[PDB]
Amino acid sequence: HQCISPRTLNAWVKVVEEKAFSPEVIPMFSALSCGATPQDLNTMLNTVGGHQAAMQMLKETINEEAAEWDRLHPVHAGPIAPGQMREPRGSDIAGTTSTLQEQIGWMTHNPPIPVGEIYKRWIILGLNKIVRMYSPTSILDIRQGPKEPFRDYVDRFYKTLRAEQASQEVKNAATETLLVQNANPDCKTILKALGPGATLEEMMTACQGV
Amino acid sequence: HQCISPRTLNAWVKVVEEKAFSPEVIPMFSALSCGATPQDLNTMLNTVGGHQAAMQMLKETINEEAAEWDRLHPVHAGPIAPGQMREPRGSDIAGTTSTLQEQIGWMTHNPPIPVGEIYKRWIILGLNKIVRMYSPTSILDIRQGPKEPFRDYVDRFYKTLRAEQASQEVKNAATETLLVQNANPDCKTILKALGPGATLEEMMTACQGV
């Protein structure tokens, strides 16, 4: 195991400062946190000053997933064989009850116990709930202005849809339901003159220059 | 043993300049100080200009832990066998009476003597006492303003609680004791209308937009 480089912490601290809890901070978290042990993950979360409300919401989500892991992967009493390793509990995956050496031993075992990937899934799950919840705009409030260029409105549309709560079933049908409807009347007449089944490229091109 | 990279010292010096002794400087200290020998740790502390009051408090805490180590791990007189190594004293773990080569020999022994991890625990223990002591706010003084958004008050709440002295038993019960009580009357009526056992996500969502 090699350590978090100073440029990796530096970039994670700065991206939380700049982008706060916008959707694009989760993929950069997972990218910066790649191959990380639970101890490295806890270090990344501990370096975040401020936003302590979301960090507390992150702890509750992790505690929920850890309790589900303990119900689905119950521990068994008994001495550990010399060649093998004890199973990780919920707190073990979160780095609470486990050491760095045990986390490595789980991640390099045969078969390996990717405790880092499991913990990262819990953190990302808790981070996804914070992003959509910190969003103050619904997809229904995204309407094209009388002179708003069509690309700018479609840009706000899918930026809102990405951070939207709702569900994937709503996001899949949002374009066919709300995009053309909430466009301004001049662009709307052009889009209806294309017929359903038109791609986004065909819609944006038909309303270019308007 | 490879040396502290110039980017690692640079990042440690700058984080002490910017964040001073806020809670998030301890995890970044432990991250930047990973796999470090006692000599590398002393170098990191010696690069800190200013804050010499806390650095002197750090020396006293380290001297206390080193004295406890000498009482719990007493030395034994006798010549060291050619294949092995002498036990580290308290000053040896702090890099005072030990060389770089002996620190490596302890950390790469079989079984290894992680003198760097032991010294880091003492430093982090001394740094934790400085952070909570340099905090000028108690969790009891965190009250939500008449128009303070609920997320901002919860942000100040857990930022104060993180740097709070008190004890973990108080921090565990602080949310159920002080959070809803010190909220403004308009958000307070909504939170009491949810019933106890509500998660933080449920509390912050119920008072959104207020």
Binding site: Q39, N42, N46, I62, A94, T97 | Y158
Partner: peptide, 12 residues
């Protein structure tokens, strides 16, 4: 529930 409020991630 391993993680505690006001405590560093990963326990003491």
């Amino acid at each position: 529930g391993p993680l505690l409020p006001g405590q560093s991630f990963g326990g003491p």
